[PDB]
TrEMBL record, chains A, E:
Residues 140-167 form a coiled coil. Keywords: Aspartyl protease, Coiled coil, DNA integration, DNA recombination, DNA-binding, Endonuclease, Hydrolase, Metal-binding, Multifunctional enzyme, Nuclease, Nucleotidyltransferase, Protease, RNA-directed DNA polymerase, Transferase, Viral genome integration, Virus entry into host cell, Zinc, Zinc-finger. Residues 45-196 form the Integrase catalytic domain. This is Pol protein. The keyword Nucleus does not apply. It comes from the Viruses. The chain holds residues 724 to 997 of 1019 of the full protein. GO terms for molecular function: aspartic-type endopeptidase activity; DNA binding; exoribonuclease H activity; RNA stem-loop binding; RNA-directed DNA polymerase activity; RNA-DNA hybrid ribonuclease activity; zinc ion binding. It comes from Simian immunodeficiency virus. GO terms for biological process: DNA integration; DNA recombination; establishment of integrated proviral latency; proteolysis; symbiont entry into host cell; viral genome integration into host DNA. Residues 3-44, 215-263 form the Integrase-type domain. Residues 215-263 bind DNA. The keyword Transcription does not apply. Belongs to the retroviral Pol polyprotein family. The gene is POL.
Automatic annotation (TrEMBL), chains B, D:
It comes from the Viruses. The chain holds residues 922 to 970 of 1019 of the full protein. Belongs to the retroviral Pol polyprotein family. This is Pol protein. It comes from Simian immunodeficiency virus. Signal peptide: none annotated.
RNA sequence: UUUUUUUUUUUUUUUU
RNA sequence: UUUUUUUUUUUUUUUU
RNA sequence: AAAAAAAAAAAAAAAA
RNA sequence: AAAAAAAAAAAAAAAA
């Protein structure tokens, strides 16, 4: 695996990953990955619901950085607020809610997190806006750790980037996609996508059942040439179809004797 | 009629392929004359008969 | 996929499919599809394709990036139609969803050096002009028209244009359902991303097969045959391509590999 | 020694092929982590462990 | 199946079969087989132990025919006794016992079935000679039916055969192999062979166990190069062998690490 | 046995086996083995093989019929060394066990018309002279020697020679065990007969395939190929042989049969 | 003989 | 549309 | 008796 | 609830 030693190093020149990501991507042993991490001068060594997010604000170089952090996975989003006001925070919440499903927001008791704009925006999306100390200190600790890691990444990256916004965006990209996490050895974005997909299993099943409750099927039973039906469709197979007649019977019909129609009416 | 049949075939295929690895109420079944239980398998329809 | 390698090749003999279509239909790795397409002398919608375009409304410039394969859109109000602002928007979009291909018109802002620098930094294949894919030539225009249509329905009960744009984007992404599957754009995008993630996790990439030479025993002939280039090294069998252009899967016990 | 090994290999093969479709005390077994019972299978040896 | 109509008829010219045998052999339907049977002018239309046999004597054309009948299957054997005496019956019993396993003989109370020769012969083979009315009348009825069928077949065949012994042998062959029976649609010889093979299953298993208790196996466990053993052999497979050591453990050893030896000593 | 047809053919290409050996090793029907051997230009122990021979002892003639593949023997005291007596003995033997092949020396009694008539009546392939099978050339002599050896151990406590012969035959058949399996002759004969009965029941014979022509689709060539002779008609697939000499099993959907 | 993936067994600890 | 082999179901009768 | 964690043994596949 | 027998229904393979 020595042939992967140079290229991986080049990657660490652009994206300041950690040893876990390099080991998982280039199939390198832990010791050499830790050595590569240490070789860089600018480098050292919860069970909430799916729709729980937290918000925070930080001051850096006379600029306001608003950070929205997913609690379960650690996916983060950052924005540069022009001025600290309720309108800007409400707009940022609306922008975040237009990309991911938000069902419960946690935040401190700051002056700009209680304005009428914040309440109106939270009411428009039909979400529960909670202000105060979170019930689980683990979420607060994780949010603080995420903010500190973001600040460290800005410090690492700013030397190569002229403008603050570009550095913040690059740090967000590195945090979301480059550095891996804990259980499962997955990036925060991958974990968030997996959790959202897992949560969206019952709704698709219900939608499929509702849609299948619409198709009609005409079937021929036995040697009788006369068609029969209409009947409700239960399943359609490659060889035969399974139907449920209005009387409750379950009938298997070969594909050559069944015709499926979805009427334009109703 | 032909357009309707083609469209409904496409929609049934797509909807069936949408759900392939998850369901509710996993069940066990006995197939043929073999008394040994088998499964678990996904439940498509539960009926009285 | 021992029995899938020949039959899929037969498809390329008849209809001359693409390697992407081969992966989509036969669930084959990218390397074997590339070997198949390179074997044929005649030959020489994905999860990571986006299309970005600008528009004007009430004296304000709005930039929209649309995923062609699902219909997911993202909008931003650009203070000016400059290369720096559009490059920053592209960087912000790339930090949320995976981007592997960007297409845009030949506007002056999309050609500036900032866009090229950002694309090089993010390792994104950026093309401009006529779209190479025959379809998806008007998806962005239709999405822009739809967004303009839904903005007016909410502009009445809204003060600032940015709030209206955000509300319209939210409604388009989550509150409207499409056809042939009945899925909103966000659900379709998440499903496609999950499927691609599972496939890439199974693949694990990292091939670096280079020009390793292979001697193989085909049929009942005991003499070594070839030499043939190495395409795929698997524990159960190895996939190789010959100088003539035939792709063959053979068990490891009758394959000698020389570096 | 070589003759003895060849002869004992031949005799073991022949004796094993003599009985292939009948035995006593058919038993049911669970293989791997699957809790479903399987069988019935012929009993070759029954031991304490 | 008309192409089989002529050839089958030719068979009925030589061996006077029944409709069941023709149907089972030439795959002809029942009606045409019955028609073929009727076309011939000289033609019309128990749970005992495996080692149960019966004996009888008949007089025909001034000759004595001794018939030994299997009870369970119906397999018969015939001989032409020169003079009706105990010595000839004992010799015939010895000849029959030298071909098939006999464990129980049922006869009548005749004069030649009680002589000292019969007792000595039955004692030599260690069999139970029972004289008197059989416990099950079904066996007696089946024996009488077999004798009547033998007489009928001899009458049918005698016209084409010069000597009596050849006719008797041909009738025995036709009865044993040509005409089928009841359950299972098998000839008497096939049924007898199947029953004997089924009865001989436990003894072969015991013999195999006893023989396997002799082989020795030397095996190598793990990475230790030193050989170990000797151990008792339990089973030998194409990929690996299963052994039982003297301490009671059961060990699976790959074929490349096991050597099987049967010593000349003991 | 779809995968067994080619490999078995390969054997006949290398060692030039016989059709009986092909059935014994690959469990193939007789018709396909006959087609395989016929297809080769070079080529142009069973359950029903017996060997009959006579001997003299104390002025009495004893005829012995021995099954070569198991060692089962049957003896009869012939009043005279005539053709009719030997024919009657053969008829009696054939009425108990299945006989499909009889071999004997060139003695005058085995050549007489009575033996030929009996063999024709029983439909038995009767041959005389040098045995065609390389082995089994001295089994009957060894069995005769063994019988003569064991008859002396019992002649002392016996009055009539026929009783001694019957007792010796019983002892040889049932009270002595052989090697490589540890089975007495009767058990081995019964096991072989049972196995052959099961195989023939599975086969069901009755082929009558005649010279029906077959057109087949081989590989991906759409055009009809042939014509080729028909070897075996099965529900799942059909086995055919071409005029060149290749035996191929094809699915029914790509086979057209002309009578 | 060394190293990775998978499978089958034994011992210890924490709960039900 | 007819006939054979196999598989899956329903009703009636005889025992446990 | 079931689940989880740590250690130990064997086997199969792969590279040397 | 299990076994056996008779009748009825459907499906797959094969010949026409
Ligand atoms: Zn670094
Ligand atoms: Zn091509
Ligand atoms: Zn007749
Ligand atoms: Zn040959």
């Amino acid at each position: 695996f020595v042939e992967q030693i140079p290229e991986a190093q080049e990657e660490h020149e652009r994206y300041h990953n950690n040893w876990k990501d390099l080991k998982a991507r280039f199939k390198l042993p832990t010791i050499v990955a830790k050595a590569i991490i240490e070789a860089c001068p600018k480098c050292q060594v919860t069970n909430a619901a799916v729709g729980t997010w937290q918000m925070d604000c930080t001051h850096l170089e006379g600029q306001v950085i608003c950070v929205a952090v997913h609690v379960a996975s650690g996916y983060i989003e950052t924005k540069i607020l022009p001025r600290e006001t309720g309108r800007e925070t409400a707009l940022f919440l609306l922008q975040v809610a237009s990309r991911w499903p938000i069902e419960h927001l946690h935040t401190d008791n700051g002056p700009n997190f209680v304005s009428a704009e914040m309440q109106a925006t939270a009411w428009w999306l039909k979400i529960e806006h909670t202000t105060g100390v979170p019930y689980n200190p683990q979420s607060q600790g994780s949010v603080e750790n995420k903010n500190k890691q973001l600040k460290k990444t800005i410090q690492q990256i700013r030397d190569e980037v002229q403008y603050l916004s570009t550095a913040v965006a690059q740090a967000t990209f590195i945090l979301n996609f480059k550095r891996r996490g804990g259980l499962g050895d997955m990036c925060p974005a991958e974990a968030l996508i997996n959790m959202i997909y897992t949560e969206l299993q019952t709704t698709t099943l219900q939608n499929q059942i509702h849609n299948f409750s619409d198709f009609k099927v005409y079937y021929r039973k036995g040697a009788n040439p006369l068609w029969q039906g209409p009947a409700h469709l239960v399943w359609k197979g490659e060889g035969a179809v399974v139907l449920r007649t209005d009387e409750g019977e379950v009938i298997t019909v070969p594909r050559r004797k069944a015709k499926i129609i979805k009427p334009y009416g109703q």
